[PDB]
Design a protein around this ligand. Structure first.
Ligand SMILES: C=CC1=C(C)[C@@H](Cc2[nH]c(/C=C3N=C(/C=C4\NC(=O)[C@H](C)[C@H]4CC)C(C)=C\3CCC(=O)O)c(CCC(=O)O)c2C)NC1=O
Ligand SMILES: C=CC1=C(C)[C@@H](Cc2[nH]c(/C=C3N=C(/C=C4\NC(=O)[C@H](C)[C@H]4CC)C(C)=C\3CCC(=O)O)c(CCC(=O)O)c2C)NC1=O
Ligand SMILES: C=CC1=C(C)[C@@H](Cc2[nH]c(/C=C3N=C(/C=C4\NC(=O)[C@H](C)[C@H]4CC)C(C)=C\3CCC(=O)O)c(CCC(=O)O)c2C)NC1=O
Ligand SMILES: CCC1=C(C)/C(=C/C2=NC(=C\c3[nH]c(/C=C4\NC(=O)[C@H](C)[C@H]4CC)c(C)c3CCC(=O)O)/C(CCC(=O)O)=C2C)NC1=O
Ligand SMILES: CCC1=C(C)/C(=C/C2=NC(=C\c3[nH]c(/C=C4\NC(=O)[C@H](C)[C@H]4CC)c(C)c3CCC(=O)O)/C(CCC(=O)O)=C2C)NC1=O
Ligand SMILES: CCC1=C(C)/C(=C/C2=NC(=C\c3[nH]c(/C=C4\NC(=O)[C@H](C)[C@H]4CC)c(C)c3CCC(=O)O)/C(CCC(=O)O)=C2C)NC1=O
Ligand SMILES: CCC1=C(C)/C(=C/C2=NC(=C\c3[nH]c(/C=C4\NC(=O)[C@H](C)[C@H]4CC)c(C)c3CCC(=O)O)/C(CCC(=O)O)=C2C)NC1=O
Ligand SMILES: CCC1=C(C)/C(=C/C2=NC(=C\c3[nH]c(/C=C4\NC(=O)[C@H](C)[C@H]4CC)c(C)c3CCC(=O)O)/C(CCC(=O)O)=C2C)NC1=O
Lengths: 177, 161, 244, 173, 160, 161, 161, 160, 160
């Protein structure tokens, strides 16, 4: 795994050079904007349990055939596996948001997830939608858009970190598609 | 002070012009309403004390400003404020007869807000008393003369606010 | 104002109007001690006044104050859809109006970089305020302490509190100049707690003359309807028959 | 102006209430010192010229620059006979008005007939304000040397001069 | 008012009302008639609403009227019912305005400070408002009750 | 700012009253004219530049105020005054939509006479330009909407005089 | 702001004098009462909310000013006025600790009458609420500290009237 | 009174007051001024003290005001608050006397017999006195509250 | 003054003085007597303090009184001793106030600007103040000298 600091190095070491001012002010701001990122991730850990229930029940609320007899989220054993998988995906997206890089999301989570689904018979269409509801919840929690719960913070703009998690979520979506 | 006629003559004279059709338009307009203006001024001169009494009774007579701590608590202050209201009514009548509020600017509004602020006189209560006086005056003189008088009453209230 | 009465500007949309002066001669000096604080009136509910609730910075007034412009970017993909429009709001915060077209061509470099999502709102407000257009309008034509009072009102939504706050900024102009004053205001703690890097500055506090001017007016002060509660006469109730 | 009785009565009229035991105690406080206040007034009227001569001498002994040329700064000090006479006249002013204030038990006569506008006049004439207060409290000490062990008369004398000194002052702190 | 709020939000940006805001003003003036009808029904059934809400409150919160409670005694109970009537009137105002501006500008800004200074438990006022909400929604149709409880819910949220 | 609905609700709320038959009367009156108001506001938004151009052409375009030594002589002053006229038209449209001139008091007329007096802007010429704009606007929007708009135009002119 | 010590030092310094026997007299007077002042300030800090509650209950809680049409009718106004009373109590406590009302002049009374007059706040009711607060405060702190606190309460009321 | 008790205790032994007793009388007359101040504060805040003590009692002992309890009804509750006022007055007397002689000679000797004859539970009176003690000590300083609760504690001990 | 500074720091937060601030005011008014005694001793030994400090300064900094130095000549040396007397007086003020507010508001704010405009080396003034500090602390006890040099050290730090 890598983070945001390591990815410029994997590049700086490939050019057999040091780390001057050129490729640093981007990293200089990252460290300076470290407070907003820690303010950002905490809002997802605070509401992680409600996010999967609002996501997976909304998946069935838009698709009642998953619980028709024979469906993927039909029985009591399969519902637990799907509610487990949703929270695993949310956990890795929170890892990638805290890291500032999607390296930990690729190899430990998305590398071998497509093959496991196709072989299991998990409907990608319904699985792909399950991530986008969580994306809509995350961008509301990061920019304090949650209409049911509000949190306390210092005022300002947080789209940067919010856009970083929106790009992570459909990166998850593109790998399992 | 300049009335409607003086203002028209000044606008024409400040350009070296003779009184053309627009000046005649304004002059005829003033001459047609002059008789109504005289009627209203006479009626207002007739009932000034009752107008002030009724406006004070409907606006600030039983409020807290007349109680201890209020501006017009003592007898000096009560008399001073009723004299002020008499001033406002008389000058509004002058302005209505003249058809021009310049007398209000020269003789009333010049340095009035500053005097009231130095004395501590509440401006909002004064504006409300003038508004109540506008009601009674329009009531007594009828609709057209009441609109004419209310023009200058609102002029005083805007200059005071 | 702690200085003469002529040091107070008219609190209008786009201003720089000081009516007291050579042509008016309505001038009132008064002895104001060094320690002294002006009673400001909050643009909004009284109780969010910040003198006895210093914690109420960052907190919305609601419908009783001016609108607040924020570049939130909260869409399910976190896109900003008001870049065109937060930029228009900043021009009014800094200038009060839309500057002329020939004036604005010197500021296109600043505007293009903001519309590409490369500037914060705070850095945009800084770039407009330290420009040659703002300086030629509000620094050079004005008395040095009249200019500080006007600029302090545009960037922070309030006039100054007293002499301690004004000899303070006045000393920065003595040593640094026009740019030293604009930077020390924007980098203040009051700025970053009220606006952050995200919000366009809005009007926060007023004066007694400003409020007395806005309110106390016909069309704003009710024509005595709080009093005058009209009720039925008792002799009319005693002769009334059924409703329907 | 207002004496102490008038100001207490005005404080009670402001809320529209009759006099209770607190204001009556306040009035009794004045009624019980009135006679010694009159004794002080008579002493001041008996010794006015000598008191002011002593005060002026003690002022000019420790501020000798007040009697020398103004320096180019066109300062109004006691340089010539004209300025000297004007300054002694002012000292008599201060003595008279603080005698009034001692008799009234109040300092309202002071700020209405002495303090209002004083600093504007002195600034326009460039009259020294430091030595001016210095001579006032010199006068206070000279008067207090007549009644020393009677502490109540000491405070009664200290009131007006100390009011004048604290109000002519600038607030460095 | 919806018109007022649209005008201020457009005024801050120094622009005319866009066609979306005008669309919404149009939809509001078109629904004004049923708004007035609903305000009628809530307005002229005020006695039963206040009475039955006061009952449900006093059965749910017996401490406030217990010996010594804030609303203990005839006068205090009358004053509490007076407060409930105040809030019902504000809800009717908000229903006709199309937005919670009347409710929030009158009765919500600084309500916690007032009720803390008076010694009244704010949760009791919230309970009374909820009871009045149930009683009032019982007298309306489905869609009407949904739209009317929309304001009781806001008043409850602001009064937490 | 408060519109007609806000004003009615405030008058009812300041007495602890529920909205009775007179409030319903005023509310129905506003609701009946709202659609005409929206039509007029749309039409005025369509033709603001042409309205200002025609008013300036008929009122002060060839007078002496535009010659060397006039108020609006240089290009700065010409642009500033046309911007002022745009302000007046936009705020009159806001007031017509709201059915209440309080926005004009809060955002336009507050301290306007004093600013114009400090700058040296002639008030009479401004009032005449606003009157000419009233003609064109009523012309373009028809009789009823023109009377509605002229109400607030005259309100601005009275607050300026 | 200047306390008793600062005022004595200033009176001595403005004359180039050393602190003589009268300055020592005043300084001893302040030093003897300082401990009582600290006790009173602590007790007042303990019971500020109850003092304000009881003063409001005895002065204006059931009058007509709290009913529709009154100043403090709505919840905004009630909260604003109780905040004002808290301000008055806190600043009176500061003045009592300092032994000098200059903080009241610099931080409270400067431009207060003008603000209240522009807002329309009744001055008499405010003075009466401050008088009721003086009763409760003297009650709670005992006779000597109550007279000390009442000095500055009356100072505020005189500066407001 | 401390002076009275010293005089009797010296009188039984047929001797003048020793220098210790005179020392203590001296210390008492020197502290009389703050004693009067504390009695002032407790005396003129009687309404809040009785009210808030009655609340804490009725919340701690709901049976006495429950249906049928000794203080059940308007009149009985008023009488119980009257008793609490009696005991607050006695505590002020004891504070100014410097000793519990006023409290004990009036209101403590034979209190169990009286309250048993009336049918009142003495533990309820003790609870009311404790609640009044907390309320009254809340309004005093540290040392003042310590010295004032000194008498409430004695009244509670005698009322077990 | 300590009381003044506590009052302002409590005023900005819109709260009464907490018990810590009142504790500290109490401790200050209790120590005021030895504060006045120390101010006495420093005040009435001013001639020796200024003289001996001027000596130590002129022996440590012979350039300032050398031919042409800032304090060169009879008048300039007298003016420098005048400045040292100014600062000793300010130190006595600060000792009685219990805090450096008098010293800092009078004589420290803008001192560098003044002495740069006059052409005087500020380090010479610092040396003079240090010499006066040693001379003055020689006349006090251990704890008194420690507390008195507490202000000379602040004046030196501000005058770097
Ligand atoms: C490290 C990353 C990591 C993951 C992502 C998951 C991926 C994953 N999911 C399942 C297994 C499963 N996953 C699902 C899920 C679903 N069916 C649907 O249509 C919905 C889209 C979705 C619920 C939201 C179901 C229903 C099963 C069980 C299949 C069955 O028994 O019918 C399995 C097989 C193991 C098992 O049976 O539990 C694995 C490896 N596990 C991991 O370790
Ligand atoms: C039966 C049908 C049925 C549905 C259609 C859904 C309803 C639903 N809610 C959300 C949307 C959401 N769901 C949440 C989740 C929460 N909100 C909180 O504040 C809590 C902390 C947490 C659950 C307790 C959030 C934060 C949003 C974003 C919008 C919002 O702020 O409410 C979305 C995503 C929108 C999209 O698809 O883009 C959907 C489909 N649930 C259902 O059951
Ligand atoms: C583990 C504990 C821990 C945290 C959670 C964060 C907590 C935190 N966040 C911020 C501070 C902040 N936090 C935000 C973030 C936001 N503000 C908003 O309006 C949005 C809701 C959200 C966007 C994601 C902003 C905008 C600031 C102030 C600007 C900044 O810090 O750069 C600050 C102030 C210090 C600073 O200025 O940097 C702190 C302590 N830091 C910690 O040590
Ligand atoms: C530190 C000194 C100081 C004071 C005292 C002060 C007062 C002050 N009081 C205000 C309002 C107010 N003040 C009151 C007070 C009262 N109403 C009554 O009927 C009573 C008589 C009285 C309380 C005793 C009310 C009701 C308002 C609100 C006015 C409004 O909302 O229109 C406002 C307007 C700010 C706002 O609330 O948005 C200020 C600035 N400011 C200061 O700096
Ligand atoms: C650019 C034109 C311009 C000028 C001139 C100006 C002057 C000005 N002089 C000030 C103070 C001052 N000015 C002086 C000046 C003098 N004292 C004397 O005895 C001398 C006669 C005189 C010097 C020759 C002093 C002593 C103060 C401080 C007042 C105080 O601290 O109370 C202040 C108060 C600000 C502060 O220091 O905090 C301003 C704004 N401002 C301007 O914008
Ligand atoms: C140029 C016109 C002019 C003169 C002359 C003048 C004199 C003058 N002489 C004074 C005092 C004095 N003058 C003198 C002495 C004398 N005086 C003489 O002309 C004699 C030579 C001598 C007596 C033999 C003494 C002893 C004092 C001290 C005052 C006292 O304590 O009585 C004083 C009071 C202040 C001071 O002590 O310096 C003035 C103002 N003022 C003027 O404007
Ligand atoms: C329009 C917005 C608005 C509100 C809400 C308002 C409330 C308000 N509630 C009051 C009292 C009160 N309110 C209550 C209410 C309650 N007791 C309880 O236990 C319950 C939880 C609650 C009833 C649901 C009580 C008991 C009092 C009297 C308190 C006292 O006098 O001790 C008072 C003081 C007396 C009066 O009614 O004039 C005001 C001003 N004023 C306003 O302008
Ligand atoms: C929203 C309400 C509102 C208004 C109306 C407003 C007016 C306003 N008009 C201004 C100037 C001006 N206004 C005019 C207007 C006119 N000249 C004429 O001859 C005509 C009679 C008239 C146009 C009809 C001119 C020429 C100036 C420029 C003055 C100058 O450059 O000296 C200025 C000075 C700002 C600047 O341009 O730098 C303001 C603030 N501000 C406001 O907030």
């Amino acid at each position: 795994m890598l983070d945001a600091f390591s990815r410029v190095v994997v590049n700086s070491d490939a050019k057999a050079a040091y780390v001057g001012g050129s490729d640093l002010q981007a990293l200089k701001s990252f460290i300076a904007d470290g407070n907003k990122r820690l303010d950002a991730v905490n809002s997802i850990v605070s509401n992680a349990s409600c996010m999967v229930s609002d996501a997976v029940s909304g998946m069935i609320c838009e698709n009642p055939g998953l619980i028709s007899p024979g469906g993927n989220c039909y029985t009591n054993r399969r519902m637990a596996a799907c509610l487990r998988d949703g929270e695993i995906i949310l956990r890795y997206v929170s890892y990638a948001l805290l890291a500032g890089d999607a390296s930990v999301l690729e190899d430990r989570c998305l590398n071998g997830l497509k093959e496991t689904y196709i072989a299991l018979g998990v409907p990608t269409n319904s699985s792909i939608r399950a991530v986008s509801i969580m994306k809509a919840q995350a961008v509301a929690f990061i920019t304090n858009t949650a209409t049911e719960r509000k949190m306390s913070f210092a005022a300002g703009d947080c789209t940067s970190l919010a856009s970083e998690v929106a790009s992570y979520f459909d990166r998850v979506g593109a790998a399992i598609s | 002070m300049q009335d409607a006629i003086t203002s028209v003559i000044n606008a024409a004279d400040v350009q070296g012009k003779y009184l053309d059709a627009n000046s005649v338009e304004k002059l005829r307009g003033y001459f047609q309403t002059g008789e109504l203006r005289v009627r209203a001024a006479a009626t207002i001169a007739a009932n000034a004390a009752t107008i002030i009494k009724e406006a004070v009774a409907k606006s600030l007579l039983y409020s807290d400003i007349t109680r201890p701590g209020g501006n017009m608590y003592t007898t000096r202050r009560y008399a001073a404020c009723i004299r002020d209201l008499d001033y406002y009514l008389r000058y509004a009548t002058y302005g209505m007869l003249a058809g021009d509020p310049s007398i209000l600017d020269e003789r009333v509004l010049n340095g009035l807000k500053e005097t009231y602020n130095s004395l501590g006189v509440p401006i909002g209560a004064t504006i409300q008393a003038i508004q109540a006086m506008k009601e009674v005056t329009g009531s007594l003189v009828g609709s057209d003369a009441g609109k004419e008088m209310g023009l200058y009453f609102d002029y005083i209230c805007s200059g005071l606010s | 104002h702690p200085y003469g009465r002529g040091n107070d500007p008219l609190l209008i949309q786009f201003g720089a109007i000081f009516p007291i002066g050579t042509k008016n001669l309505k001038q009132n000096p008064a002895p104001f001690g060094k320690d002294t604080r002006r009673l400001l009136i909050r643009r909004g509910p009284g109780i969010y006044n910040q003198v006895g609730n210093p914690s109420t910075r960052s907190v919305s007034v609601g419908s009783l104050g001016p609108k607040v412009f924020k570049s939130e970017g909260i869409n399910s993909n976190a896109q900003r859809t008001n870049n065109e429009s937060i930029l228009q709001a900043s021009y009014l915060a800094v200038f009060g109006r839309m500057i002329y077209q020939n004036e604005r061509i010197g500021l296109k470099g600043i505007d293009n970089k903001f519309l590409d999502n490369n500037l914060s709102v705070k850095e945009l407000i800084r770039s407009l305020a330290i420009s040659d257009t703002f300086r030629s309008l509000y620094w050079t034509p004005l008395y040095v302490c009249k200019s500080i009072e006007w600029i302090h009102y545009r960037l922070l939504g309030r006039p100054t509190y007293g002499r301690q706050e004004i000899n303070q900024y006045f000393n920065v102009a003595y040593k640094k100049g026009f740019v030293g004053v604009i930077n020390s205001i924007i980098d203040s703690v009051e700025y970053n707690e009220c606006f952050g890097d995200n919000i366009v500055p809005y009007e926060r506090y007023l004066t007694a003359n400003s409020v007395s001017q806005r309110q106390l007016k016909l069309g704003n002060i009710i024509k005595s309807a709080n009093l005058k509660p009209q009720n039925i006469e008792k002799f009319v109730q005693l002769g009334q028959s059924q409703t329907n | 102006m207002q004496d102490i009785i008038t100001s207490v009565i005005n404080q009670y009229d402001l809320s529209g209430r009759y006099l209770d035991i607190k204001g009556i105690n306040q009035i009794n406080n004045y009624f019980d010192t009135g006679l010694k206040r009159l004794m002080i007034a008579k002493l001041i009227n008996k010794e006015a010229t000598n008191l002011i001569k002593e005060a002026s001498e003690l002022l000019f002994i420790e501020q000798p620059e007040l009697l020398r040329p103004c320096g180019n700064a066109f300062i109004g000090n006691a340089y010539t006979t004209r300025r000297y006479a004007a300054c002694i006249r002012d000292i008599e002013y201060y003595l008279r008005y603080s005698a009034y204030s001692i008799i009234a038990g109040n300092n309202s006569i002071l700020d209405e007939r002495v303090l209002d506008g004083l600093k504007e006049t002195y600034n326009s004439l460039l009259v020294p304000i430091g030595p001016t207060i210095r001579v006032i409290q010199l006068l206070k000490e000279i008067i207090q040397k007549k009644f020393s062990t009677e502490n109540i008369e000491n405070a009664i004398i200290a009131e007006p001069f100390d009011y004048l000194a604290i109000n002519l002052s600038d607030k460095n702190l | 008012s919806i018109v007022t709020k649209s005008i201020v939000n457009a005024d801050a940006e120094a622009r005319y009302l866009s066609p979306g805001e005008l669309d919404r003003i149009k939809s509001f003036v078109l629904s004004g008639q049923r708004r007035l009808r609903i305000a009628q029904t809530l307005t002229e059934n005020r006695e039963r609403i206040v009475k039955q809400g006061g009952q449900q409150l006093f059965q749910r919160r017996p401490d406030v009227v217990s010996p010594g409670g804030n609303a203990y005694g005839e006068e205090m109970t009358a004053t509490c019912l007076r407060d409930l009537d105040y809030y019902l009137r504000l809800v009717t105002y908000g229903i006709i305005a199309g937005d919670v501006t009347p409710i929030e500008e009158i009765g919500l800004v600084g309500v916690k400070e007032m009720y803390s200074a008076l010694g009244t438990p704010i949760s009791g006022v919230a309970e009374g408002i909820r009871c009045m909400k149930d009683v009032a929604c019982s007298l309306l149709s489905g869609e009407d009750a949904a739209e009317v409880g929309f304001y009781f819910d806001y008043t409850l949220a602001a009064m937490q």
